[PDB]
Amino acid sequence: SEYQNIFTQVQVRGPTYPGVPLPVGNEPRTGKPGFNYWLGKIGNAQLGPIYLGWLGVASLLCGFVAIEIIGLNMAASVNWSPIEFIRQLPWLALEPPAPEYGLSLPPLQEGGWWLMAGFFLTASIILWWVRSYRRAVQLGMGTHVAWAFASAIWLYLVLGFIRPLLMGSWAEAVPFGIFPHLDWTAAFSIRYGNLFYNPFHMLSIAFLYGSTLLFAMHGATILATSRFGGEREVEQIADRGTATERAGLFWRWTMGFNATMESIHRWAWWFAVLTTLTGGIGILLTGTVVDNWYLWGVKHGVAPAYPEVYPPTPDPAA
Amino acid sequence: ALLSYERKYRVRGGTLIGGDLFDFWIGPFYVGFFGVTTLFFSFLGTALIIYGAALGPTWNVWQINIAPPDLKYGLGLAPLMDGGLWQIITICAIGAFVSWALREVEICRKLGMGLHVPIAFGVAIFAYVTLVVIRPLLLGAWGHGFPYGIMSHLDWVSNVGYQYLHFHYNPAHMIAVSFFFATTFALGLHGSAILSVSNPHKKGDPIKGTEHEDTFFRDFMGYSIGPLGIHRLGLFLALSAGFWSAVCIVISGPFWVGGWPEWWDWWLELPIWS
Amino acid sequence: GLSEDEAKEFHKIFVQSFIGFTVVAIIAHLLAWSWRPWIPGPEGY
Amino acid sequence: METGALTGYMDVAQVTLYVFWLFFAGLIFYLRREDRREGYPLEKDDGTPEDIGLVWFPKPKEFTLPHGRGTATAGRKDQRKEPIEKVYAWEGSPFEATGNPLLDGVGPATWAERDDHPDLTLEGVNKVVPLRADPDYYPCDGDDDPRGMTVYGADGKAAGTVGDLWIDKADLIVRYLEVELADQPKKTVMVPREFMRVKGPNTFFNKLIGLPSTQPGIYVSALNAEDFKNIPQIKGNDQITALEEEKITAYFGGGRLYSTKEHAGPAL
Amino acid sequence: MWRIWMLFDPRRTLIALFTFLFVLAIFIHFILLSTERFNWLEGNAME
Amino acid sequence: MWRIWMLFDPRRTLIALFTFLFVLAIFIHFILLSTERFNWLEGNAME
Amino acid sequence: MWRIWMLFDPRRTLIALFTFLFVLAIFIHFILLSTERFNWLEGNAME
Amino acid sequence: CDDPADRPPLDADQVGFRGVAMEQVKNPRLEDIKRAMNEVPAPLYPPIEGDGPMASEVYENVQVLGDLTADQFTRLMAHITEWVVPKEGVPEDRQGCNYCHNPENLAEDWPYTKIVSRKMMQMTRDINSNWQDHVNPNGEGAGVTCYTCHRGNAVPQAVWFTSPEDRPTAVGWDNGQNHPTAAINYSSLPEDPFTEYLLEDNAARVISAKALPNGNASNIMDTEYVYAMMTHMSQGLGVNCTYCHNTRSMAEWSQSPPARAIAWYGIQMTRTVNNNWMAPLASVIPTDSSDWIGGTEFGDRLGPTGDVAKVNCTTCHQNVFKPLYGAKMLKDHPELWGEGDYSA
């Protein structure tokens, strides 16, 4: 039995790191950093500090308003019963506006609250995105986080804003609930003929599978070479060590090709962003330009034809 | 044929079976004994799939379908053109997947690496054998496995999902999806983090170390897991996604037959709020 | 880390502004009651 | 025309799919170019370079290092003479060490020519330091302190005792164990954290339940106790160089094949 | 009972107690609002 | 009661109190809007 | 009351206050647009 | 998990092509319980196929059983007492076959149950005659008796009322969904698809007929109503979606099992009986809820909106793919054959 580098056996404690000095024009960091023993078992023990600039407080306030609108509406749906609130929490939702209103502003009685929560949640997410951009720039680091985040926002925006805008109805958008938004997801595929046959849904799943596959490969590869300092990836990129060589050689000998320490994270970055990028395009296509994906599959020779175990059933409604 | 740093590592030993006889390379690929068995099972399985494609109605890549036998055949071997070919390919696939994992073990030993990658691949193999062996075994028929076709097995997923009227309500499926979503979210963050420090915002800027990596996430989300933690967590999320996927499909049918939303009535009928 | 003198001074301002908040709220509640009282009674409004 | 239709059979979804196929093909081509920034150009088993063209092999990537360390070029070619000989003549054959592969840096014991300077924090001081050089850092309470425990080899024989802990300043974690050798020619030896297992009464399932450890200590299954004496020695005190880190960790990596020989030869 | 403050830190105890009391008060108000009899805003008739 | 500020930091107490007060005010306004009698925007008749 | 700036940074408070006021103003304008009576764009008849 | 628990061994019937996963895996132990629950009671005595005085001549107040021989008329009276009148919890004055009758004179329609029973006599014969496309699919169907939808209870255990319209509130709008409802499998799907499809004439179809968009106005919210209705149909028949659909091509009738066509007739027939036989009962059933036999103990005769308890697929399938597992109970009771032939 050898050490598998799953949990840190010996943690050390010292002064907390306050972060690299930010350039002038930045707010002071908030919070007093502390050490969490159980977090240090897996990774860094230090919790905080956090940066709360104008973007952070504005995004928190906008997100707080959206959550409060959702939560108070779900609480009101169970007659303000906290017992029924907890019991029915996965089933409750802030329902999207009724289809009769189209894109017009709906009353509070028929989905006006959903539009406000969607607006404030979108503002919170957008303000969080620029904060992700700003925090990277202020440290001098590249803005890879912000643009990977933009891909996730892209699917979020098409799901609740862009596609309902194209369909001309806020009713096409996702309810703010746990089970109801699963119902919407199931109903969306059912309405547009088996979203399995959406080729961009296929692509999104391939990248979602690939992203999970890549992190399984990359996480295991780095842990298997962490005995040679493989976890210090940026140091390996600048100054290649035997950990990078062993990591590349393992995959070169396995599947005939390999990446570098830097380029594997380019594979990781692109596979993740392509999951939501392809997914957002696929969602944007259905209802606007394709209305039955299975029939699109049979039109393009995608859907298999199965042998008839029963005679074809005539539609009794003529 | 060799990377500029590859020559020193191309040494003997580390094999499990065969030892010296199969210890060589063909181009970039290491062979080993399990590489030969991987090639044997891969060629046999691929050839039988192509043969089933040739004997099928169409050569359309999306429409090629090697279906499992009928449920009436139970756990026995069906005729080759009535699902028996699928059964043979399934054995070849399992032989190829296990040989591939064992080949990775030999390469890991030869390089002094840990066995994390073959173990992580074992979770993927476990999900496949759950879909193709364990769940059909618990249901009593090999015809419960998914067919071998690019689009036919997607139809299988849809029909199995709707065999429980709402597969989103499956509790283990809910956990598995969240892990799949979490590992992609973590992968995007981790790839972005490493690229951000190795590719600074201003071109030709000093490269950033782990302090900037920690500081950005502490500035951004208030916590940084560190370079070691993200690979531990990323592997954990990916393996949890694979593991809970096997759980979610193995409990559908063998241990739950009704609609998945029915299952949540235990929570609604708890004596604290009944 | 507040000394006793500053603690008294904060409390003096805190109490005064708390009264101002409460007095404005009291007026708001008196106006609300004159509009629509919120205690039903046996018949229930 | 139908709303999605383009040419009777062509529709918007189909051409959008083909647009992505073009982009994906370009992305895969771009990603493979990034994969070739290290390890290329390829060379034959005898060292003769292979032909790479230009559309695949990208221009060298120059990283400007911090702390005034200059600039680093990806694809550094190691200059040490390889003490290996091809077992057979045909390409793809393994290579046999013309000496002791454990000390020569061959196979699992291979070490790359990393920088001969210590890793530095952003402030500019050494990242990896012993606990004797910085009392501001200490082992965390609730975790067994390796300092004092005896280090056992793979064969179960005692190899020495921990004398100090080398920690990373950036990430508050133990990086190396300074082991005072039980056998002396005070010769100290560095054991990387990932190559050792702590078996004290505070690890887990022992602090949770309260069970004392039967045989507490540091257990190293990578090397036998006899091979601990040959672990590469750091040149200086209170400072470990990145090249010295590589050689120590490469020596442990080759131990399972060359020291204990449990990976040497087939299992069955 | 005055010696409990040698064990409990008065600052953290007051923070936990004040937070607990408000959450309980909101919990109880919300419970009554859900009931037909004690919903003072809906004004359902008694008996 | 001035001694409460020897324990509680006046700054974080004011931040907590103000955030506390706004949430409660938003709660009550939302609850009144959810009722028929006290929804001033919709203005249902009394009795 | 001028001592409120001894405790809170005038710049940071002004940023927080202006953010709060605009969010509340948008919230109230949005709520009115979600009412039959007070939607000045829809222009429903009074009473 | 359930009682009996779902575990190996299990039964599986395959309806579609191999590998399409068009199958139903069910608990054999739960099936044995259901088969015991759906056992058909034996007839009291064989049918009186002989002739004799007509019922309308012997008895004065006969409106619907006018074609019955006086011996057939008495046989039906005895059987419907076993099928509708529960022998447990009935008030003393309504026990036996006094449940629908004044003991002093039987020609008096004093209890509301007698007037209701007259309507159900016409409804049962109308189902058995004009809706054979569902209950007698090709001349070998089981048909329907009073026991089929009553099962010995005064009120069928599976009924549905129109969901009362929620109060228009500025906060907490739920759109008739977002609450766990047992009828739709404890999901968040719309709680009342029954009024949408089993009361008014709405086709539960949302899927477009062509690959590219055209004049299809169905939105996601109204497919959730279809989804809720189909969840009830699957739950009410104890089957899954693949019993009637190849879910990859859900709208394709050419890929659907023949059970889907029969289920379509069930939707039309259930809608018709709800509109022509169940809804008009509101003028007959007393609204006081104290004039109901046994009070509310046997169940609510009316809903919150004052509507009659309407008929579901679950009403008299009762979680079985065929009522009473397809047992031919109506064959032994020719009195309830309106115009269809259910012999053998």
Ligand code: BCL
């Ligand atoms: C019956 C159901 C249908 C189906 C219906 C849909 C629908 C509808 C969609 C998908 C989508 C996807 N489907 Mg699908 N899908 C089916 C079957 C599958 C199967 C399977 C094996 O059966 C798999 C693996 C998948 C997997 C996938 C993914 C590839 C893709 C989602 C990408 C993603 O991660 O976005 C998830 C992340 C987001 C959506 C948001 C990203 C981040 C945002 C910004 C989060 C903000 C957080 C916020 C601030 C938190 C506070 C909020 C408040 C508390 C409220 N589907 C079947 C056929 N599927 C999505 C897609 O794009 O595909 C084309 C999609 O819209």
Ligand SMILES: CC[C@H]1c2cc3[nH]c4c(c3C)C(=O)[C@H](C(=O)OC)c4c3nc(cc4[nH]c(cc(n2)[C@@H]1C)c(C(C)=O)c4C)[C@@H](C)[C@@H]3CCC(=O)OC/C=C(\C)CCC[C@H](C)CCC[C@H](C)CCCC(C)C
């Ligand atoms: C590449 C695509 C994948 C992806 C990537 C991705 N996601 C990202 C990012 C990236 C690269 C970010 O940088 C960003 C981030 O912040 O990451 C840490 C983010 C993020 N992805 C998130 C979620 C998320 N990602 C998802 C998916 C994915 N993300 C894809 C798989 C999903 C899914 C599957 O649904 C979710 C749910 C967030 C964790 C984060 C963006 C968070 C954000 O925008 O927040 C804005 C601010 C708020 C909403 C604040 C609200 C909460 C406050 C606590 C309100 C209350 C205030 C106050 C405390 C009130 C006090 C009240 C009391 C007094 C009563």
Ligand SMILES: CC[C@H]1c2cc3[nH]c4c(c3C)C(=O)[C@H](C(=O)OC)c4c3nc(cc4[nH]c(cc(n2)[C@@H]1C)c(C(C)=O)c4C)[C@@H](C)[C@@H]3CCC(=O)OC/C=C(\C)CCC[C@H](C)CCC[C@H](C)CCCC(C)C
């Ligand atoms: C469990 C966590 C995730 C994971 C992990 C994971 N996968 C892995 C690994 C790891 C750690 C490897 O090391 C290994 C590898 O080598 O990666 C490059 C691998 C791998 N994961 C792969 C694919 C893969 N992983 C998937 C998923 C996942 N892998 C999980 C999400 C999927 C999904 C979800 O679809 C796929 C397709 C391969 C690229 C590779 C394993 C290669 C292998 O087994 O090589 C030997 C076999 C062949 C070369 C061919 C065999 C062919 C058969 C004989 C016939 C065909 C049988 C098959 C059933 C046909 C089915 C067809 C239809 C489904 C269309």
Ligand SMILES: COC(C)(C)C/C=C/C(C)=C/C=C/C(C)=C/C=C/C(C)=C/C=C\C=C(C)\C=C\C=C(C)\C=C\C=C(C)\C=C\CC(C)(C)OC
């Ligand atoms: C004190 O606090 C208490 C109440 C506890 C608060 C607790 C609240 C709780 C428990 C809340 C629970 C919330 C849950 C469970 C939420 C679940 C949300 C889920 C699962 C959402 C999933 C998907 C939703 C999506 C994709 C919605 C997207 C919506 C969008 C993109 C809306 C965009 C709207 C815009 C941009 C509006 C613009 C305004 C316009 C332009 C229309 O103005 C004219």
Ligand code: HEC
């Ligand atoms: C009681 C009066 C019934 C109601 C209400 C509904 N159904 Fe029915 N159904 C009924 C009978 C007596 C039979 C048996 C006919 C026979 O073949 O012997 C059926 C049959 C079906 C079937 C066919 C089952 C099969 O395996 O082929 C289906 C699919 C079916 N019923 C569906 C169905 C649905 C969906 C209903 C609600 C809308 C419904 N039925 C109502 C009696 C009654």
Ligand code: HEC
């Ligand atoms: C299923 C389709 C049914 C068949 C066949 C028959 N009945 Fe029925 N019956 C059915 C329902 C859903 C209800 C409830 C209506 C309500 O408002 O509650 C009934 C009700 C009756 C009653 C009234 C019971 C009472 O209020 O005490 C009677 C007396 C009755 N049914 C008799 C009856 C007879 C005699 C039938 C066979 C001829 C019969 N019903 C068939 C559903 C169905």
Ligand code: HEC
């Ligand atoms: C038989 C008893 C069925 C079961 C079980 C399920 N469905 Fe169904 N479905 C059935 C019929 C007869 C019809 C036609 C309805 C009509 O009035 O014409 C349907 C229809 C649908 C549709 C709409 C199809 C369309 O053209 O738009 C959908 C989307 C649908 N069914 C989905 C569905 C699902 C998801 C089911 C499992 C839970 C399911 N159905 C079960 C008959 C039967």
Ligand code: HEM
């Ligand atoms: C064993 C007990 C019962 C006996 C002896 C009995 C006897 C009779 C008799 C003799 C008549 C004809 C009355 C007349 O017109 O003069 C009759 C009619 C009727 N009975 Fe019954 N009955 C019994 C039980 C029931 C029950 C339980 C129901 C209800 C389910 C019922 C429903 C009716 C109805 C509706 C009529 C009117 C027939 C018509 O209008 O066509 N009876 N019964």
Ligand SMILES: [Mg+2]
């Ligand atoms: Mg819904």
Ligand SMILES: [Mg+2]
């Ligand atoms: Mg309601």
